[PDB]
Amino acid sequence: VVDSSKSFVMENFSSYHGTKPGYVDSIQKGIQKPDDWEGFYSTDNKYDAAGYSVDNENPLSGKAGGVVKVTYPGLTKVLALKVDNAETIKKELGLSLTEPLMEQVGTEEFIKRFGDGASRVVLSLPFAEGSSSVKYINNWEQAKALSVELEINFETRGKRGQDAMYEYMAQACASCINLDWDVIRDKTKTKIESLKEGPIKKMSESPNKTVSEEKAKQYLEEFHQTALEHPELSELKTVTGTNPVFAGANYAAWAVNVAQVIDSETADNLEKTTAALSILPGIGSVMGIADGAVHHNTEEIVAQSIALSSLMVAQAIPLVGELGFAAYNFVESIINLFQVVHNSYNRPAYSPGHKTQPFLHDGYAVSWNTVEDSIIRTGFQGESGHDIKITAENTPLPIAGVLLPTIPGKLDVNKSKTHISVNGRKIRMRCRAIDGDVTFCRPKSPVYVGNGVHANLHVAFHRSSSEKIHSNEISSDSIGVLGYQKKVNSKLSLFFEIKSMA
Amino acid sequence: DVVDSSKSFVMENFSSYHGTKPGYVDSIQKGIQKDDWEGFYSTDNKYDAAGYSVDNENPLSGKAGGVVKVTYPGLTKVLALKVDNAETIKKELGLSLTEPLMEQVGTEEFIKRFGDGASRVVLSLPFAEGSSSVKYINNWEQAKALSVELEINFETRGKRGQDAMYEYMAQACASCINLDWDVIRDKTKTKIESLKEPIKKMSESPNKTVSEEKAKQYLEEFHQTALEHPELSELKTVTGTNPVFAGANYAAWAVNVAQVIDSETADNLEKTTAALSILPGIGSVMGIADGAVHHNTEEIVAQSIALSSLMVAQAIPLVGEGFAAYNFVESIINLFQVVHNSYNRPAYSPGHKTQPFLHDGYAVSWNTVEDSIIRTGFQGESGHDIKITAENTPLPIAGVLLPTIPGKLDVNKSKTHISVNGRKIRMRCRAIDGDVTFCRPKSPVYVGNGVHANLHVAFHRSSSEKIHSNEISSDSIGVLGYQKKVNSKLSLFFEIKSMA
C-alpha cells in the first residue's frame, strides 16, 4: 500500500500551490482552512500548480492568480501511496475506519508510526494519468507550519487574457512552441485593419443577407481565395497550399459554423464565447495542426491565420448568423484555444503506436495490449510473447500480414507460437524472411476486422544468445502490421523499445 | 504459482478433439503416433478443432479433413497453467531446465507429484485471446494410450469448397448466420446466366483498356441497369439507402478485382483467394456495415454475388489482363464464410470491456476490464478510467453523461476529472434529472494525433444495497464530442456486478 521507492524524509520539504486571483497576497500570511481527503493540496511541479490558478467563476477565459511555494521547516515524511481509496488505505494500514483518513494523518500517533522521525506526514499520490508529477495532501493543522513564498503572480505581469500563465507553462520545455502572444495579438490587429482596407472590399459581391449554408460556403471559399492574394497573408498562402486540412473549404466551414452558434447573448461575453467555440470541430484548419504536428509555429503565420479567420467570420455572420464580434471577442477567444492546444503538444506524451496509445489509420485501430507487450526484453536466452490488438471502424478490412524485426543469431521469430486470433478463432501464420533483419508473416486463413470483429496478433520472439541487443543491430523500432492493398499496403505501426531485464 | 487450481481437475475417460487434415482422417483412428512444447495438441471445443483441418498446401481455399475425438482410459489429470513460458514453468515447478518440459510431463516422476493419482497428465492453456476454449498438450508417449473416434469427416459430406467445415462451425450458435451455401451457389449460377439474357448496356462498353475513372463511371451505369432486372429486385430495395452498398462501391470493388487478377492468378483458386483477401471494399458486396450482417438470406446473398460477378466480368476488359463466373465466385463465397463465421462467434462489441468505440474520428475505451464494471453491494467509492483520443486534427470533448440512482449511486464531483497529456482538468457536474449527471471540463479539452486524455469517473454509493436492474436506465457512459444541434456520442458500456 506504501510505495517505499516514492517515500522519503526530507528537510525543508517544499511544494507548489496554484492560487486564485485575489488570494496571491492573502495566502502568503499562512495556510488556513476556509471527508477522508479534506486537506491542503500541492504538487511538486510548479507548472501543474499554475493550472489551478484561474478564476473559478470564469474558468475557460478568466484571469490566472499565481503560484506560491510552501515549505515546512525541519523534517517531513512524504508517504507515497499505491491506492487512492481511503477505505482500503485505512484497513491495510490497520487504523480506525471511523475517523477521516486525513484527520488521522495529522495525529501524533500516525506521525510516530509512519514519520520515520519527521515532524509530520504528507501524503503523495500520482498527479494524473499521463503525468510524472505527484500531488501532495497535507493535513490542515500541520499546514499551519508552512512558510509561503511567492513563485509567480500572473496578474502582476499585466498581460492580456491568460498569456502570462501559458508563457509560464511553456518554460517547462525551454520542439517547444514558445510564442510571444503580445506580438501575435499586435500583428493580428494590424493585419485585420490592413486587410479591411481593394480586391477584398469581393465583399460588395456578398449576399449580405441570410442565405443558405451551401451558398454561404461557396462565397466564403471565393472570399478566402481572394483574401490570400493580399501580401500580408503571403506566407500563409504558401504554407496552406498543399495540406488539405488547411484549405479554403475548411476555413469556410469553420467560419460558417462559428456564425451559426454565436448569438447576441453569446457574443457579448468572453466566457460564453469560448465555451461555444470550444465544442466546434475543425479548429485544426485555423491552428495549422494536422498529423501530430503544430505546423503554424511562428508568431507571423499564426497572426496571419487568425486574421484571415477573423475576416471570414465577419463575412459569414450576415450570411447565416444573427448579430464587431469577429474582430474582438472571437479573436480573444480563439487565442485562448490556440494556447490550450499548443500546451497539450508541448507536454511530454506517448505518440500513436507507442506504449498503449492506439495507432489510427485507414479505418483501422491497433495498439499494444499492455505496456510490457511493447518492450522487447534483452539479455537472456529464451522466449517472449507480445499481444497487439487490431480492429476497424466499420466494414470488414483485411490484415495481410506483419513485418517483424530479426537480428541474425540473436533475435528470431518463433514461428510456431506466432499467430493471430479473430474473435477467438486461432489462425496460424506462415513466416518467411525478406532479408536478414525483417521477416514477413501471413495468416494461413483470411483475416478481416471491423465493427464487432477484432483480432489479437500474438508475436513470439526467440533469443539464441544471452548477449544484449545493441542499437546498431536494429534498423526499425516498429512492427509493421499490413492492412489492405491499394502497389502499396496500408501500414499500421506498433513502436517497441529494447530494454534489459528488471 | 503457475498452476490454476480452479481450472485443474482429474477426470475419468477424459476426452478432447483434434482437427485432422485431409488424407489422415481414417489413418489417425488407428492411433496417435508422432522442443519444450513438442507434443500432441487437442482442444475441448470441436468447432475450434475443425479450424485445424484444412489442407496445409492450400490453407486459404483447400479441402477440410475432419475432427476426431480422443479419449484416455482411466483417470487423467488436467493441469492448467497460468503462463506459457516453458522456462518460467520449469523454475516455479522445480524441474530440469536441460530437459524439455513436455518430455518431463510424460515421466512417472512428473505424474507422481502433479497427477493426483491419475495415470498421466495433460497440460491445459487458454486456446486464444478472445476465446473461452482451452488447448491441451499431450505427451507423445502417453498419447499412445488414446482411443480415437471419428467426430465428423467433411469430405464425406461431399459438398463444394469448404461448405461442410463452415456449416459445422455454424452449429456452435444454433443471431446466427446459418446459410445453405448449396442453395446460394445454385441461385447464384441461375441469376448470372439469367442476367446475361437491356443488360446485353454491354454494347456501350469500351471493350478495351481505358482509365479507372471512365471504367468506374461505366460500371456505375451497368450497376443501375443491372438492378432493374427482376432477379435482383430484393437487392435493389435493401441496398438503396446505406451508402456502403451503393453502386459506386460495387464498381470500385469490381475495378480493384480486375486490376489484381492476371492469368496465373485466375487459373488457381488458392491464388485468387490470396489476392482477393487483401482488397478493401468487400463489405459492399457482403452487405456488412455498422456491426451487422445485413445480407443474411440465401436469396439476397446470391443476388449480391451474381451482380458483382457480372460487374467483374465487365471490368476485366476496361482494366484487366470466364474467371468472373468461375474462380471469382468460388473465392468470394469462401471470404463470405470467413466473415460470417467471425460475426457468429461470441465477441465484445465496441465500447464493451477493452474494445474501442470508433466514431467521428474519435477512439475511446475503458482502460481495463475492471474499469467497465461498476461494483455494487457496499457503501463507498470506486474509480473508472476511460482512454480518449482522435485520429488527426484537434477534436473537442464537451463533457460526459453519467448514471445516477437517487440516494444510492452518485458522482463523486471531487474525484471526477479529465487529464489531457497529463494536464489535470477539474469538472463541473450538474444533474440533468435524477438518473443522469452531466460533467463538463473546466478548461477546454481537445484530443488528436499525439494528444490523448484519461477521463476518471468516481462513483460514491450511499447505500450498501445492491443496485437493481430497474434502477438504471442506461447501460453506457456517454462521452460527448464535437457539436454538429447534437454532440458526437461516444459510448462506453458498463456492467453492474456484486463485489467479489
From TrEMBL, chain A:
Any one cellular-component term (Gene Ontology): extracellular space
CDD domains per the UniProt record, alphabetical: ADP_ribosyl (cd01341)
Gene Ontology MF term list: NAD+-diphthamide ADP-ribosyltransferase activity; toxin activity
SUPFAM superfamilies (UniProt xref): ADP-ribosylation, Diphtheria toxin, C-terminal domain, Diphtheria toxin, middle domain
Pfam families (UniProt xref): Diphtheria_C (PF02763), Diphtheria_R (PF01324), Diphtheria_T (PF02764)
Gene3D superfamilies: Diphtheria Toxin, domain 1 (3.90.175.10), Diphtheria toxin, receptor-binding domain (2.60.40.700), Diphtheria toxin, translocation domain (1.10.490.40)
Xref: InterPro entries: Diphtheria_tox_rcpt-bd_dom_sf (IPR036799), Diphtheria_tox_transloc_sf (IPR036801), Diphtheria_toxin (IPR000512), Diphtheria_toxin_catalytic_dom (IPR022406), Diphtheria_toxin_rcpt-bd_dom (IPR022404)
Domain spans labelled Diphtheria toxin catalytic: 1-174
Diphtheria toxin receptor-binding domain span: 351-499
Disulfide bonding pattern of the chain: C173-C176, C431-C441
Name the UniProt record assigns to this protein: Diphtheria toxin
Organism whose genome encodes this protein: Corynebacterium diphtheriae
